[PDB]
Amino acid sequence: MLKQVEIFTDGSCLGNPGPGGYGAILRYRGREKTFSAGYTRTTNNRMELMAAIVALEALKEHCEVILSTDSQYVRQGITQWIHNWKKRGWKTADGKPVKNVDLWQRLDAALGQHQIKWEWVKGHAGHPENERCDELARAAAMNPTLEDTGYQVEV
């Protein structure tokens, strides 16, 4: 039995916008939960954020987590953008709402309930769990059943 919650995420998209999906592996308590869904019209970036959101949202109590992903978008957001978005009220320099603000605020809310360690893998050298995510994400995008409600061509 693992003392740290382990999460692995990936997201994929066939277009911009296009049908996309995500895959996430969660090792919580003594179980390994797997999440995956396809969305009819979304983006890669939104799928990459959705992966992390659904895994964290499954945690019912304060945990110590290690999240592993090769997503550059999550990484940049977490390491360069988030901190400043929050002080600016979630707006860009030109004064409009940040892109995918719906998902970033949703992710922010989840993050805030836990102690998180981020492990940025290289696409070609992730663990077996990341490769599995990629494959589920890819499969899900070939058979989308959900609608990505916050997706705008816009804002």
From Swiss-Prot:
Keywords from the named record: Cytoplasm, Endonuclease, Hydrolase, Magnesium, Metal-binding, Nuclease
Gene Ontology CC annotations of this record: cytoplasm
UniProt-annotated location(s): Cytoplasm
Reaction equations catalysed: Endonucleolytic cleavage to 5'-phosphomonoester
UniProt xrefs under CDD domains: RNase_HI_prokaryote_like (cd09278)
Domain of life: Bacteria
Single GO MF annotation: endonuclease activity
Outcome, altering D134 to H/N: Slight decrease of activity
GO BP: DNA replication, removal of RNA primer
Pfam family of the protein (one): RNase_H
Keyword rRNA processing on entry: no
Phenotype of gene-disrupted mutants: In a strain that encodes a retron, the msDNA is abnormally sized.
EC number(s) on file: 3.1.26.4
UniProt name for this protein: Ribonuclease HI
Native organism: Escherichia coli (strain K12)
Species lineage: Bacteria, Pseudomonadati, Pseudomonadota, Gammaproteobacteria, Enterobacterales
